[PDB]
Design an enzyme around this catalytic site. Structure first.
Site, short mmCIF file in Angstrom:
data_model
loop_
_atom_site.label_atom_id
_atom_site.label_comp_id
_atom_site.label_asym_id
_atom_site.label_seq_id
_atom_site.Cartn_x
_atom_site.Cartn_y
_atom_site.Cartn_z
NE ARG A 77 -8.38 6.76 9.45
CZ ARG A 77 -8.39 8.07 9.67
NH1 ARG A 77 -9.37 8.63 10.37
NH2 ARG A 77 -7.40 8.82 9.19
CB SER A 127 1.72 -0.07 -3.95
OG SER A 127 0.53 -0.77 -3.63
N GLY A 156 -1.19 10.02 10.05
CA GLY A 156 -2.57 9.54 10.19
C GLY A 156 -2.64 8.04 10.00
CE1 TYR A 181 -3.74 5.35 -6.63
CE2 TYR A 181 -2.51 3.32 -6.99
CZ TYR A 181 -3.61 4.12 -7.26
OH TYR A 181 -4.54 3.73 -8.18
CD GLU A 208 -7.35 -2.47 -8.53
OE1 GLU A 208 -6.44 -1.94 -9.21
OE2 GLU A 208 -8.42 -1.90 -8.25
CG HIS A 219 -1.86 1.19 1.18
ND1 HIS A 219 -3.13 1.16 0.64
CD2 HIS A 219 -1.68 2.43 1.66
CE1 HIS A 219 -3.70 2.34 0.82
NE2 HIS A 219 -2.84 3.13 1.45
N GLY A 220 0.79 2.04 -1.06
CA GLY A 220 1.43 3.35 -1.21
C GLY A 220 0.48 4.47 -0.87
CB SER A 221 -0.39 6.65 1.33
OG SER A 221 -1.55 7.47 1.34
N1 LIG Z 1 -2.83 2.84 -2.59
C1 LIG Z 1 -2.39 1.69 -3.09
O1 LIG Z 1 -1.30 1.21 -2.78
C2 LIG Z 1 -3.26 0.99 -4.09
C3 LIG Z 1 -2.92 -0.31 -4.47
C4 LIG Z 1 -3.63 -0.98 -5.46
C5 LIG Z 1 -4.68 -0.35 -6.12
C6 LIG Z 1 -5.04 0.95 -5.75
C7 LIG Z 1 -6.19 1.81 -6.11
O2 LIG Z 1 -7.03 1.67 -7.01
C8 LIG Z 1 -6.08 2.94 -5.19
C9 LIG Z 1 -6.94 3.96 -5.09
C10 LIG Z 1 -6.83 5.28 -4.48
C11 LIG Z 1 -5.74 5.74 -3.73
C12 LIG Z 1 -5.73 7.02 -3.20
C13 LIG Z 1 -6.80 7.88 -3.40
C14 LIG Z 1 -6.85 9.26 -2.81
O3 LIG Z 1 -6.88 10.21 -3.54
N2 LIG Z 1 -6.89 9.39 -1.46
C15 LIG Z 1 -6.90 8.29 -0.49
C16 LIG Z 1 -5.83 8.50 0.56
N3 LIG Z 1 -6.04 9.80 1.23
C17 LIG Z 1 -5.68 10.01 2.55
N4 LIG Z 1 -5.33 11.17 3.06
C18 LIG Z 1 -5.01 10.89 4.40
C19 LIG Z 1 -4.56 11.73 5.42
C20 LIG Z 1 -4.30 11.18 6.68
C21 LIG Z 1 -4.48 9.82 6.91
C22 LIG Z 1 -4.93 8.98 5.90
C23 LIG Z 1 -5.19 9.53 4.65
N5 LIG Z 1 -5.62 8.99 3.45
C24 LIG Z 1 -5.96 10.89 0.25
C25 LIG Z 1 -7.02 10.71 -0.83
C26 LIG Z 1 -7.88 7.44 -4.16
C27 LIG Z 1 -7.89 6.16 -4.68
O4 LIG Z 1 -4.97 2.78 -4.39
C28 LIG Z 1 -4.35 1.59 -4.73
CL LIG Z 2 -1.54 6.57 -9.53
#
Ligand SMILES: NC(=O)c1cccc2c(O)c(Cc3ccc(C(=O)N4CCN(c5nc6ccccc6[nH]5)CC4)cc3)oc12
Ligand SMILES: [Cl-]
Ligand SMILES: [Cl-]
Length: 240
Positions: free
Chosen positions: A108, A134, A101, A137, A218, A92-94
């Site tokens: 969440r 991931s 958070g 993201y 996914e 999971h990437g962010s």
């Molecule tokens: N993420 C993966 O590795 C990953 C792996 C495989 C497939 C996918 C797939 O389709 C997604 C969708 C996705 C991701 C992101 C967002 C998006 O814009 N936000 C979600 C996270 N937000 C957020 N701000 C936060 C602030 C504090 C605490 C927690 C927080 N959380 C920001 C908005 C939309 C769709 O992701 C995939």
């Molecule tokens: Cl992306």
């Protein structure tokens, strides 16, 4: 001054951008440096090397630090899913700005008032078996080329296997998760077991799935309790 190891101090500084040790406690997460030369480290570096997708060629990934993580009480929270079959170590990437958070509250489900845009299977917790899918993201750039990525133990159980976008209101009876079926999959024969968890670190092969929207798998769970965060990697993105 901090009594944390230097690599954890640098992780804290990156996450918070108060004293370092006070900021550590706000994460409510036990953080340990995995040794570079450990078997754990070899397996994780192999997962990164082997599951970089061919279509994600804007950057290469180097693992700077590997952290073993334990969210406060996430153990007790994971208890109902602990012995569910098909437990998988997934990415999971962010954005870096989200990690305070994510560690303090866990991953969440997006709130009802966030767009469903980007979620092929509706609001849930999304994982990949391809590090780059991931890592995309993390929203790193040449000017901000360091990102943070998680490995979670995900209790997938019986997977509802879908090839096209569908915002399911409810899983079918006896299903625990959704798997979006990609054209390319880690070679299942190369799966290994780390701490009773399946690690699909095989190089990408054709899945032989036809009529699918997805290049890559996914995995989605709709209960926060199906996730046990195990590792946090600090990644260098080398942009081309
Ligand atoms: N993420 C993966 O590795 C990953 C792996 C495989 C497939 C996918 C797939 O389709 C997604 C969708 C996705 C991701 C992101 C967002 C998006 O814009 N936000 C979600 C996270 N937000 C957020 N701000 C936060 C602030 C504090 C605490 C927690 C927080 N959380 C920001 C908005 C939309 C769709 O992701 C995939
Ligand atoms: Cl992306
Ligand atoms: Cl649901």
């Amino acid at each position: 001054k901090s009594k944390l190891p230097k690599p954890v101090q640098d992780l804290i500084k990156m996450i918070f951008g108060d004293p370092i040790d006070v900021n550590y406690e706000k994460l409510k997460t036990d953080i340990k440096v995995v040794d570079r030369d450990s078997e754990e480290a070899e397996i994780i570096r192999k997962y990164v090397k082997n599951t970089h997708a061919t279509t994600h060629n804007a950057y290469d990934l180097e693992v700077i630090d590997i952290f073993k993580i334990e969210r406060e009480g996430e153990c007790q929270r994971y208890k109902p899913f602990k012995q569910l079959h098909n437990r998988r170590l997934l990415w999971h990437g962010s954005r870096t700005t989200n990690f305070a958070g994510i560690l303090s509250q866990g991953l969440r489900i997006a709130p009802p008032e966030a767009p469903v845009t980007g979620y092929m299977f509706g609001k849930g917790i999304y994982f990949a078996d391809m590090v780059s899918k991931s890592a995309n993201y993390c929203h790193t750039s040449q000017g901000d080329p360091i990102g943070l990525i998680l490995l979670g133990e995900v209790a997938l159980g019986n997977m509802y296997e879908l090839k096209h976008a569908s915002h399911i209101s409810k899983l079918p009876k006896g299903k625990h998760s959704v798997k979006g079926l990609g054209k390319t999959t880690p070679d299942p024969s190369a799966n290994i077991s780390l701490d009773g968890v399946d690690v699909p670190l095989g190089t990408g092969i054709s899945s032989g799935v036809n009529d699918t929207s997805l290049l890559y798998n996914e995995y989605i769970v709709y209960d926060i309790a199906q996730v046990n965060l195990k590792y946090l990697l600090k990644l260098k993105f080398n942009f081309k």
